[PDB]
A paper describes a structure:
Laccases (benzenediol:oxygen oxidoreductases) are copper-containing enzymes that catalyze the oxidation of diverse compounds by molecular oxygen. The active center of laccases contains four copper ions: A blue (Cu1) mononuclear copper center (T1) and a trinuclear copper cluster (T2/T3); the latter consists of the mononuclear T2 copper ion (Cu2) and two T3 copper ions (Cu3α and Cu3β). T1 acts as a center for the reception of electrons from the reducing substrate, while the TNC serves as a binding site for the molecular oxygen and its reduction to water. Three-domain (3D) laccases are monomers consisting of three cupredoxin-type domains. two-domain (2D) laccases consist of two domains and exist as homotrimer, with the T2/T3 located at the interface of domain 2 and domain 1 of neighboring molecules, and T1 located near the surface of domain 2.
Numbering used by the authors:
A (entry chain C): 41 to 315
B (entry chain B), C (entry chain A): 40 to 317
Amino acid sequence: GAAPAGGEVRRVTMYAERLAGGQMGYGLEKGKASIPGPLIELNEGDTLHVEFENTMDVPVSLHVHGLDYEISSDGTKQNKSHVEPGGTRTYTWRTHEPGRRADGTWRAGSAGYWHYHDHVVGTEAGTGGIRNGLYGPVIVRRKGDVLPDATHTIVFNDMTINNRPAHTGPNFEATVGDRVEIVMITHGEYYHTFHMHGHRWADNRTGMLTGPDDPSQVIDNKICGPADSFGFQIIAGEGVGAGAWMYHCHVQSHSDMGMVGLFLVKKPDGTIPGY
Amino acid sequence: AGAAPAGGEVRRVTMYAERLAGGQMGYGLEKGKASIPGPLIELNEGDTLHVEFENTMDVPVSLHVHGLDYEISSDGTKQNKSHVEPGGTRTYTWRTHEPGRRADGTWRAGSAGYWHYHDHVVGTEAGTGGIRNGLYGPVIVRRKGDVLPDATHTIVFNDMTINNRPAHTGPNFEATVGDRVEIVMITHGEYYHTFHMHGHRWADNRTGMLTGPDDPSQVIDNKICGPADSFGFQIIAGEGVGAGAWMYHCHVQSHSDMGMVGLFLVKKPDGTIPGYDP
Amino acid sequence: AGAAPAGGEVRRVTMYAERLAGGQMGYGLEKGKASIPGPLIELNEGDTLHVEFENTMDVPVSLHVHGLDYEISSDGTKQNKSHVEPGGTRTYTWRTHEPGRRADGTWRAGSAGYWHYHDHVVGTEAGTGGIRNGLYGPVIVRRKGDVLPDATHTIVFNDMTINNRPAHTGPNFEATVGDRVEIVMITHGEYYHTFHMHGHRWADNRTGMLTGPDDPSQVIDNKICGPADSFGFQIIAGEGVGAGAWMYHCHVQSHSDMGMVGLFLVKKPDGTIPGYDP
Ligand SMILES: [Cu+2]
Ligand SMILES: [Cu+2]
Ligand SMILES: [Cu+2]
Ligand SMILES: [Cu+2]
Ligand SMILES: [Cu+2]
Ligand SMILES: [Cu+2]
Ligand SMILES: [Cu+2]
Ligand SMILES: [Cu+2]
Ligand SMILES: [Cu+2]
Ligand SMILES: [Cu+2]
Ligand SMILES: [Cu+2]
Ligand SMILES: [Cu+2]
């Protein structure tokens, strides 16, 4: 369970479909789009050719943060990288390992907790596409990265989580001891503060400290604005046990209005104390 | 005052929740001595703390902590039936661990940090009314070896107030040039803020100070923060700048204009503050 | 090309605050050449800078610096009798120090980094008025061995504007592929922002670049910020992504929609910009 060195040329098909009640979403199979979009994982140095079809009645696009891409895979109307209704296009994202340039300076790699979103619906910033659900997660791993038993994606989109109605979660389950991975993405108009009862993480790339020499901060509350993305890995219930562990936006009115879910950590027998 | 020692001590303490004056509420180590911010709790990594907690109010209350290990019974939440009815008592158990290598070879991150506690049931099940009335306080958790300060001041940007004070009433904080002052900065409520100090800068890491010439941590003097963010640092009062009334404030302009200002009065050894009229 | 040298030079400069067209205000090194942002001040750790200051306006003005070392008399505040009357002159001194180990064993953080200066007395004692009008400038303090860039651009999100500009006027900035471009990014006013660059990313640390494989700083391309935050980075133009009109915007959706967008214009070595067809 560690991430290998990348350098595969991988391929996938992505569709932008309309969903029930105003929503739109990406998906890897027509008829099966989802909010948030399907998780895309790659290893540093991979290349991904995304074979896109807009199946809707309005232009759409696909725009990625942090990964490498030429101006033709930008995903913006300004560059004519959008997709007409019914249209088709192939976006290419690349990645690079870190290393030294000819300069002798250090080039950082592509690894990170990133995301992809529309950039053309509603306005030329994607405002109404993001709002409708056109977003999702991409993880790019470094060699030797520790792999999880599970990855869950939490998006604070304006005043919702993953576009869901108020006080509907989502909830996620695990078993005590599971290495659980969280991808956290924020979108829209408002700043937020992500809080987890019972668990904490480092505020670096991996969410876990390099070792005793790692100056990274350890936190359980993280301010995030539109298009911030971060992620971490927590041992489920470490030092605290099983339970319905609340996670929420800690802005008080935001938590009060619905931006809450449960991290249901289970005992080996499958039962949750108090739930 | 030296360096933080290794932890491991089981500690115990009594805590109450008292209505204060002006529709406020607060936390106290003794009855009739609730404060806003609540009493400063310091453990070292390893220590356990048993808070014999009692509610002296006519409405339920709770105690919820950030950053420290605790079981679900001391969650502080109506969902986990861990609140304290009017007139009730409860023992909240917090614990802390050291950092260490896991079985799988990964680094478990310590309990140390600048943390905080607050209510979770007054007003709404997130504790909005309780946080608003003053039911919050600081928790410092040291790691073995941490430099310890000459003094410690807690600054809580609560919505549009510092420590639930009225506009433009600071609070002010005194020190003397050369002192090692530790600031604990917590934020609560609805608004983002940006915390700024005149004359003084710190490292945006755990301890607010740099490991050494290899610590890559950012050296800031302005720091955005949102509800339930908690950080702190230590500075040398007047270092490289000398004595005087050194402003701190929220750098959100309308917040500084509408009261989120205070002075960090840095005295000469003789006790006087250049340029400043008490 | 180059490297920051060690500091230690005393330097001097003239500064003028002047009214500009349309109730605006800005700073300048020469009279009549006032800009928004104000002129870029650059120093190396150790340097002292005396700034011969001229208030050409009819309204008092002040000069207030983040991050650097100054005594209360260069505080630039009404509080510390530190503002410049209409038609007044005044020398403001800024000092900077190298990082060094203190006599008490701790590490003292240096002055280096991406800082700024701004007015503190116009409109309010927070300088809310003069900051809105455009009285704010960038300050860069260099650590010895820092990589010096081919070009430096300053990007101030001032409330809902970029450099006080009208909506949807950039600024746009040009580079050639492979050029070492240093962004200075400041925020002011009332609102939080998220700064985003297409096709480019940087280290969230002091220099925006990682020092080596054991630098644990995050690699981001979207940075949240608020009034008086300042940061910076150097990127290699088009590295791994090539030439093009690379959009930089605030990613708060209503903020880019309403004009907070500009272009990073990266040219091929033949000077062309594929796709650019405004
Ligand atoms: Cu964009
Ligand atoms: Cu929120
Ligand atoms: Cu909590
Ligand atoms: Cu984006
Ligand atoms: Cu909570
Ligand atoms: Cu504020
Ligand atoms: Cu200042
Ligand atoms: Cu909390
Ligand atoms: Cu100020
Ligand atoms: Cu903005
Ligand atoms: Cu982008
Ligand atoms: Cu300032």
